[PDB]
Design a protein around this ligand. Structure first.
Ligand SMILES: [Zn+2]
Ligand SMILES: [Zn+2]
Lengths: 598, 87, 398
DNA sequence: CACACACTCTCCAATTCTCTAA
DNA sequence: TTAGAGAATTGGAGAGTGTGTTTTTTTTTTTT
């Protein structure tokens, strides 16, 4: 048993008296400071830590963890009773006028309190949240599958009577409630006045509300099982912390959903459950001098996938893909090869390095396609758009394996992306436009066997030229025997299996975070071409077109491609004007990509 | 239970009734000659408000039809001749 | 009385607000000279439209507090401004006649919020948001005055809508029969109403996120002014209403559904004898044929005869089987100028269309019949060739 | 099932009938 | 002769009771 009044007094004592020596030994009363802020309305949410509560009463922490909703109410009541001690927009105006009438505690309450969970509690998986943990504070990890828009949830409804000019209040707890109709005040009832109640949305307390669904991490599920899911209901300042696809740990109260009416007799003693979220947590000039070393271009190209030898100019092209040209701007590239040629490994490296990216197969996936898809979620039945590799990759790069094996719907979708960088999709017969400006990194196979150079690329790869010409660079990752390189590759693979790590390579790859910083500040530079370099572009382009005509996949898009690549290298040099080396690099990269194809 | 108001002479001699009607026009003002329509509108507005406060259940015209009959009763009549002049 | 009126639990006086807005109308001569909105109220007398558009920036510059009261309490203030405008429209021009009372339509020129950041604290505020219309419902008839008739004795009465409900008479005044007054639906009075679903613009979205959407409701005289696919800055009141758990039960979900009570639209992506004489003089210019053919598609190079043929197609032959429509075929490699030329020229003429020859075309060449999703009835969806009945149809990858 | 239609049944009281005084 | 107090008859307000509540496989014709 418990004496909850004494518990409230002990909670008041903790809030008044706790200090933690923050800001390097200033002996701050942290909860007193936050109480001052709440009283002044400069702060709305108060995340009390049960690790702090443990430092003077472990029994109180146990009582909170075992009966969390009760103690949430007790902590809130204690804080509200203590705000005047530390009291040195529209609802504020209404509370002022109601104080004038005095001259509904839940309405006058304009703060919220949450328990930041204790570190002694291990963070569970969703599957480990047993029925014994109902009504108890639990910490749960998972992927955020889906999040609803923030909606207003009525906490305390406020009505006004037409006949007697009196306000009436209706606190709300259940997910459904009966709105009041006829006036209950005695001056209406005794006079039989027939006065009725009008809801005042202006003078009634709402709260931000958001419904999301967590899901098990795939590598923690048992072997033969579907991943489990849990509905998480989020209120107040906890809203908008999460996004779909994010990894989170949620401290909250595991509770049952108490439905009304016909569902009660149908379900019987069983009940659905939700997690009442209390806390959601989410799982350089020396370096610029290193960048300043003029090796940096080749240093980065070496840092790109030391697991793959050779193809260094392809690595340079991939670097320029991540950099992008002047804003168009995406350096789409394609690299064909046989199966197993290390082509997939290279694409996997770009997907891992890039800050925003996706990796998928052109074929036929049972997942969400390259375009987004509309899920149903039939417990609610509300259809919602989700995913899409191109959409998830929007600001970055989308990697497609076996691009040749795409369906015609996928080919038309990529064609639309190449044209205008947006796609069309239907939710419920109606349709919208959905945005995707990702660069495409395409890997494709020969239609049959190992590539034969005697056959042209479109006839061999079996892709339409309308798509295949979109890519700025076309590379052929051909594989043939070579004794010493095969032995080096084998030694690398065997060391990887033997030690689970790449062997030393007689150099140090740059940190991927530092590479990301570098390409970010690089992408923030905005080059422009001068007229002399435009003339140089003209001369180089016409000579290259002579070579292509004498050996035809060269057009105005070729001039635009070399301009894009030269501006990309100008970004790489981190200078706001292009130079002869940029055009030379673009010309040789295109030429030697054709040579690789030849 | 069954606490239904009635509007009989006890209601009319309550505080909200004739004792209130003796005083409701203390705040009022009238324009007089040539503006009798506006003065009538103010007059009916004030006494309609008084009727509503006294017995909200009825419309004003129905309230008048009730009260014009109900004034004949002896209790409200004695209270009337008290209100007239003074106690 | 007006001076005694104050907005509920707000201390903003209605009469003071009305007089302040009348002062704004009287004094605001300086958008950068008569007052601008009194010039508009001079124009409305002959134009005949029932509305006055006003800029919230102008109200803010004239008076910060009046603008703040408008934004905070539009539900009371906008009717007060309507009363002010209808008083001014008979103070000035007292002999005028107009079929409806004037509706003021405040708006900020730019978005005050984006729809992802709307909060419960914004409920019943005046806001404006940018978006693209996804769907536009049928014209909903919404009742505004209920006409009741006695089934026994043909006595009729009329009752106003209170807050969507009806105060049904319950007994006929001319024959005292209970439950004898019946609602005559077609003798009742109705206003126009329409639902519009608005999606945030693509540039405003965060990186790779699916769109948020909001529901709009547009009432009489502002009802059918937007179409799907267009872009608008829409100003309205951010309402929050309860939704019933079941159609036969009055219990309501604790979570309120929200929508925009639209006050003003501003489309943002839609955009004489002097013209006649300029065109007539230009027709006499030497090599006008080459001039117009060169004006066609400035981005495209050297294709003189192709542009000349396209020009002759766009002018067409003499109507009067005497088909006057000129048919043109462009032929060449993929990636060449023909697709760009088609995508350019389709928007250069009225009644024009552009579509793909493949199955991925948004509007097909063939007419077909489909179930209209919002109502699930058959609709004859004609193809691009039929929709371009007196224009050019650009068929790419023919 | 718990929240709404439809029907029955009960007693309160609203209005008129009759006798009396002014 | 006219108007108020006591007794009788019937309307109906209220309580109680009863009832009502997309997604997969297999086929068929026609489209290429
Ligand atoms: Zn009341
Ligand atoms: Zn009747």
């Amino acid at each position: 048993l418990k004496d909850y009044a004494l518990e409230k007094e002990k909670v008041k004592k903790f809030l008044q008296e706790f200090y933690q020596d923050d800001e390097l030994g200033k002996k701050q009363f942290k909860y007193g400071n936050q109480l001052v802020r709440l009283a002044h309305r400069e702060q709305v949410a108060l995340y009390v830590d049960l690790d702090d509560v443990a430092e003077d009463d472990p029994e109180l922490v146990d009582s909170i963890c075992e009966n969390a909703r009760r103690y949430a109410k007790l902590f809130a009541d204690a804080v509200q009773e203590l705000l005047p001690q530390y009291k040195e927009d529209v609802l504020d105006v209404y509370i002022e006028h109601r104080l004038m009438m005095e001259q509904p505690a839940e309405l006058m309450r304009r703060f919220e309190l949450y328990f930041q969970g204790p570190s002694s509690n291990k963070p569970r998986v969703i599957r480990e949240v047993r029925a014994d943990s109902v009504g108890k504070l639990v910490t749960v990890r998972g992927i955020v599958t889906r999040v609803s828009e923030v909606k207003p949830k009525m906490v305390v409804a406020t009505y006004t009577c037409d006949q007697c000019g009196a306000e009436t209040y209706q606190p709300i707890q259940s997910p459904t409630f009966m709105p009041l109709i006829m006036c209950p005040s005695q001056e209406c009832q005794t006079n039989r006045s027939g006065g009725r109640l009008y809801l005042q949305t202006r003078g009634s307390r709402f709260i931000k509300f958001q419904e999301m669904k967590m899901q098990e991490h795939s590598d923690q599920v048992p072997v033969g099982n579907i991943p489990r899911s849990i509905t998480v209901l989020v209120e107040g300042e906890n809203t908008r912390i999460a996004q779909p696809g994010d990894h989170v740990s949620v401290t909250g109260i595991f509770l049952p959903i108490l439905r009304t009416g016909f569902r009660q007799v149908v379900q019987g003693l069983l009940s659905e459950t939700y997690l009442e979220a209390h806390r959601i947590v989410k799982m350089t000039r020396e370096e610029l001098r290193q960048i300043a070393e003029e090796d940096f271009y080749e240093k980065l190209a070496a840092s790109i996938a030391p697991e793959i030898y050779g193809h260094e100019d392809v690595k340079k092209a991939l670097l320029l893909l991540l950099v992008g040209g002047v804003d168009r701007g995406n350096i789409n590239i394609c690299l064909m090869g046989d199966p197993g040629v290390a082509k997939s490994q290279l694409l996997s490296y770009i997907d891992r390095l890039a800050p925003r990216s996706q990796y998928t197969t052109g074929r036929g996936s049972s997942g969400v396609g390259l375009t987004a898809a509309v899920l149903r979620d039939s417990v609610s039945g509300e259809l919602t758009l989700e995913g899409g590799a191109l959409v998830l990759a929007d600001q970055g790069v989308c990697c497609i394996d076996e691009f040749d094996k795409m369906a015609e719907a996928d080919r038309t979708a990529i064609h639309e992306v190449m044209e205008q960088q947006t796609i069309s999709i239907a939710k419920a017969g109606i349709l919208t436009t959905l945005n995707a400006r990702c660069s495409i990194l395409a890997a494709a196979n020969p239609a049959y066997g190992r590539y034969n150079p005697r056959r042209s690329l479109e006839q061999n790869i079996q892709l339409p030229a309308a798509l295949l010409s979109r890519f700025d660079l076309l590379w052929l990752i051909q594989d043939r025997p070579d004794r010493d390189n095969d032995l080096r590759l084998a030694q690398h693979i065997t060391y990887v299996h033997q030690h689970s790590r790449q062997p030393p390579s007689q150099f140090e790859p740059l940190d991927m975070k530092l590479m990301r910083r570098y390409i970010a500040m690089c992408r923030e530079k905005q080059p422009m071409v001068p007229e002399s370099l435009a003339d140089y572009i003209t001369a180089a382009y016409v000579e290259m077109r002579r070579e292509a005509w004498a050996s035809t996949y060269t057009s105005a898009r070729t001039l635009l491609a070399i301009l894009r690549l030269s501006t990309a290298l100008a970004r790489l040099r981190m200078v706001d004007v292009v130079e002869k080396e940029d055009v030379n690099e673009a010309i040789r990269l295109m030429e030697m990509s054709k040579d690789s194809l030849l | 239970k069954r606490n239904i108001p009635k509007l009989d002479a006890q209601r009319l001699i309550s505080e909200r009734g004739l004792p209130a009607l003796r005083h409701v026009f203390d705040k009022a003002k009238f324009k007089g000659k040539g503006h009798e329509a506006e003065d009538l509108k103010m007059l009916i507005r004030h006494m309609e408000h008084w009727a509503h406060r006294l017995f909200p259940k009825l419309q004003f015209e129905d309230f008048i039809d009730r009260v014009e009959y109900l004034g004949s009763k002896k209790e409200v009549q004695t209270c009337l001749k008290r209100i007239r002049l003074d106690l | 009385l007006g001076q005694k009126l104050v907005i509920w639990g707000t201390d903003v006086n209605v009469a003071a607000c009305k007089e302040n807005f009348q002062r704004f109308l009287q004094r605001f001569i300086d958008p950068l000279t008569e007052p601008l909105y009194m010039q508009r109220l001079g124009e409305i007398n002959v134009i005949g439209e029932p509305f006055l558009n006003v800029n919230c920036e102008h109200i803010k510059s004239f008076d910060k507090n009046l603008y703040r009261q408008l934004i905070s309490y539009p539900q009371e203030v906008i009717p007060t401004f309507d009363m002010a405008v209808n008083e001014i429209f008979f103070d000035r021009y007292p002999d005028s006649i107009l079929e409806h009372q004037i509706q003021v339509r405040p708006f900020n020129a730019l978005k005050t919020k984006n729809m992802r950041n709307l909060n419960p604290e914004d409920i019943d505020q005046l806001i404006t948001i940018s978006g693209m219309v996804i769907r536009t419902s049928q014209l909903i008839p919404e009742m505004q005055e209920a006409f009741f008739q006695c089934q026994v004795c043909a006595h009729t009465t009329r009752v106003e809508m209170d807050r969507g409900r009806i105060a049904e008479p319950s007994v006929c005044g001319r024959c005292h029969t209970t439950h004898s007054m019946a609602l005559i639906h077609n003798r009742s009075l109705f206003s126009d109403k329409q639902m519009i679903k608005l999606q945030e613009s693509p540039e405003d979205m965060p990186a790779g996120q699916t769109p948020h959407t909001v529901i709009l409701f547009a009432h009489n005289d502002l009802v059918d002014k937007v179409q799907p696919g267009d872009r608008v800055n829409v100003t309205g009141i951010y309402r929050a209403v309860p939704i019933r758990v079941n159609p036969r039960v009055s219990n309501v979900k604790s979570v309120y559904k929200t929508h925009i009570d639209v006050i003003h639209y501003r489309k943002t992506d839609a955009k004489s004898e002097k013209r006649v004489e300029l065109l007539k003089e230009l027709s006499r210019k030497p090599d006008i044929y080459e001039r117009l053919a060169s004006a066609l598609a400035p981005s495209i190079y050297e294709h003189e005869d192709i542009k000349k043929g396209i020009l002759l197609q766009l002018f067409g032959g003499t109507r009067k089987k005497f088909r006057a429509e000129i048919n043109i075929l462009l032929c060449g490699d993929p990636g060449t100028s023909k697709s760009q030329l088609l995508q350019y020229v389709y928007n250069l003429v009225p009644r024009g269309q552009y579509t793909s020859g493949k199955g991925s075309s948004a509007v097909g060449l063939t007419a077909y019949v489909m179930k209209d999703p919002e109502t699930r009835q058959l609709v004859l969806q004609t193809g691009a060739l039929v929709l371009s009945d007196n224009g050019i149809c650009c068929i790419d990858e023919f």
